[PDB]
Structure 1
């Protein structure tokens, strides 16, 4: 393989073994003032997501043109309110919600975003951005619009004095810092089989399968309740302490922990364990991201929960994650998804998750370091 675009970028080569830790190139001290040129007939437009019409145009571009599974059966369906949670966290900047429109019709056909984040990578903490929501309309694919969108958001980030970034993708590019796998835990196996997310497995009847996946109707952990405003400080303390053990993690302020964890229905759920002394000792969290089931006459949507950050100090993680399943089931989810990062491999098989297809690769831009095992990746992105 060569990479016509990625070979020009300050990332390590696929196959180069990395022993050192540091930037790939030194920081730029004069940056290009003009936007990169789009192909004829298309124009940049910075999207004001606080305008409901504009946010709905972004909802529509992503609903019709964003990530599908490996078999072209399911497409993410991020909701407008979820996209406001994902894209306006503390420190968001309007120039970093970077849209491409057709000049004549004004139709939105491309987007890429950055949001700021402090990242801990081995022994270094650096201010970075997280790049997400790169999308080109299906009618514009394979025309090298993606390199323009990546160079343009690179420029706009460099203008604000930031020279590293973190991102994930399901394709292999120069050069993954860590390689993760999604696993899936059936909550509504009948629907999952029916829409062919799942198959009737290996000598089990549907009757047996529904039994195999049946869960308790209420969680078992004493003192589990939703996170409230008074818990913001201790959730922040728990998380900060917990993440020290991994090699790629976010460093969140208390304002960022309020944004990422405070519960918002149909977006983000966080439950804390408040013990018999009134102290919060653990928490679990998961976010809501349904998928469209394409071209299907009856079932139009699959409701999935995604494991976010789960912190245990007194409750065994196995038991916390069992309660997350019970909770997602009560909340009407069809499937609970989790990656094999952090300590998750200690529960995935025990709790009857099955491995999925594909991988999720993590990447750093303009930062060279040794790659790490999934168990040392402690960052989860939307």
Structure 2
């Protein structure tokens, strides 16, 4: 059985392994290029490239609107991600960000923004190799421009722009199956406000249960249990960096963060990123938990307009049991007004998902490397979370 809906006209031309090729080697698919195309790729007539300065508030709003109206939706068209402008700044301007890697497509005549793709730099540990790579995210084509082969042009153009800076590998996640996943993860969900989630058909009411009984089943403590939990502060930057660096060594695909990157990714910003640390009776920070804020717009519901979701980010345990840490994460999310807590089955997350009453969801998230041939891994060896 060859075809399963995709004969990969674009992807078969790219330096990636074929779907169903078993990989036993480790290394690049093609050599580092010593001459790179200087000219942007040709777009269809009436469209032009534009590098978006997200420090211009109006341009940031334009990107916000493109994504708010055209980024990831569920298959029944009830929910769409609603990344805030300030979130987008957090995700797209980490240390080493470049304006040319905020790659937009605009209509020539009206200047309307109809396409986007982004690269951010990251050091990536893949098995026994550490490479400088980029992370690709926020690939989006306006709904009215769909299936016109614009996505391959966006992909080739960010590839060129990244090659110009001397980087020849990338890491990316998507919901679609492409040549070739290095790992596959599943989304899991922990109800915090089950009433609302049942009302908007995110969850279903179980066979023999009432609304009041489902509320009781998912009821959480009013405050966390772990001794010495508190918000991350500036003084915790070094130890958070140390804890994460050491904790991530056990996995096979991880970021390798500088202290400035740890500051950027974890230092709390209201309604974007939350990090809590465990400072013990000695004064030592031994664990931390983190989650980011990503609501989804709710279409076609009479009462509820926004689904408030917290996403598990990086959780490091050395002295507090992981089960207790995540229990505290759920409590903190509840306290802050989240409707649901989402997590993937990567890292050690399978050790707590069922025990803490997460339900499995519909969506697979595929992890990919560009121009790096290595064996695939189980979800539990994946130690990388992209927003």
Structure 1 stretches of 4+ with a deviation exceeding 6 A read none
Question: Is the CA contact (8 Å cut-off) linking 1:176 and 1:371 kept in structure 2?
Answer: yes
Question: Is the CA contact (8 Å cut-off) linking 1:273 and 1:280 kept in structure 2?
Answer: yes
Q: Displacement, 1:311?
A: 0.2
Q: Secondary structure at the match of 1:116?
A: strand
1:301 to 298, 306, 322: 306
Q: Displacement, 1:71?
A: 2.0
Q: Secondary structure at the match of 1:322?
A: helix
Q: CA RMSD in A?
A: 0.6
* Number of equivalent positions: 382
State TM-score, norm by structure 1: 0.99
Which deviates more, 325-334 or 195-204?
Answer: 195-204
Q: Displacement, 1:233?
A: 0.1
Q: Displacement, 1:106?
A: 1.0
Q: Displacement, 1:340?
A: 0.1
Question: Is the CA contact (8 Å cut-off) linking 1:227 and 1:263 kept in structure 2?
Answer: yes
- Who is 1:271 aligned against? 276
Q: Displacement, 1:125?
A: 0.1
- Work out the CA distance in 1 between the residues paired with 2:193 and 2:230: 24
Question: Is the CA contact (8 Å cut-off) linking 1:24 and 1:367 kept in structure 2?
Answer: yes
Q: Cα deviations across residues 65-120 of structure 1 (Å, max 9, x unaligned)? A: 00011222100000000000000000000000000001111110000000000000
Q: Displacement, 1:294?
A: 1.3
Question: Is the CA contact (8 Å cut-off) linking 1:118 and 1:128 kept in structure 2?
Answer: yes
Q: Cα deviations across residues 98-147 of structure 1 (Å, max 9, x unaligned)? A: 00001111110000000000000000000000000000000000000000
Q: Displacement, 1:218?
A: 0.3
Q: Displacement, 1:249?
A: 0.2
Q: Secondary structure at the match of 2:362?
A: coil
Q: Secondary structure at the match of 2:353?
A: coil
- Who is 1:194 aligned against? 199
Q: Cα deviations across residues 4-36 of structure 1 (Å, max 9, x unaligned)? A: 000000000000000000000011100000000
Q: Cα deviations across residues 29-67 of structure 1 (Å, max 9, x unaligned)? A: 000000000001011010000000000000000000000
Question: Is the CA contact (8 Å cut-off) linking 1:236 and 1:257 kept in structure 2?
Answer: yes
Q: Is residue 237 from structure 1 mapped to residue 239 from structure 2 by the alignment?
A: no
Q: Displacement, 1:345?
A: 0.1
Q: Displacement, 1:332?
A: 0.3
Q: Cα deviations across residues 186-238 of structure 1 (Å, max 9, x unaligned)? A: 00000000011111023211111000000000000010000000000000000
- Work out the CA distance in 2 between the residues paired with 1:296 and 1:104: 37
- Work out the CA distance in 1 between the residues paired with 2:10 and 2:237: 43
Q: Displacement, 1:298?
A: 2.3
Any gaps of 5 or more consecutive residues in structure 1?
A: none
Q: Displacement, 1:2?
A: 1.8
Q: Displacement, 1:356?
A: 0.3
- Who is 1:111 aligned against? 116
State TM-score, norm by structure 2: 0.98
Q: Is residue 335 from structure 1 mapped to residue 340 from structure 2 by the alignment?
A: yes
Q: Cα deviations across residues 149-207 of structure 1 (Å, max 9, x unaligned)? A: 00000000000000000000000000000000000000000000001111102321111
- Work out the CA distance in 2 between the residues paired with 1:31 and 1:201: 57
Q: Secondary structure at the match of 1:358?
A: strand
Question: Is the CA contact (8 Å cut-off) linking 1:262 and 1:269 kept in structure 2?
Answer: yes
Any gaps of 5 or more consecutive residues in structure 2?
A: 1-5
Question: Is the CA contact (8 Å cut-off) linking 1:102 and 1:108 kept in structure 2?
Answer: yes
- Work out the CA distance in 1 between the residues paired with 2:367 and 2:39: 30
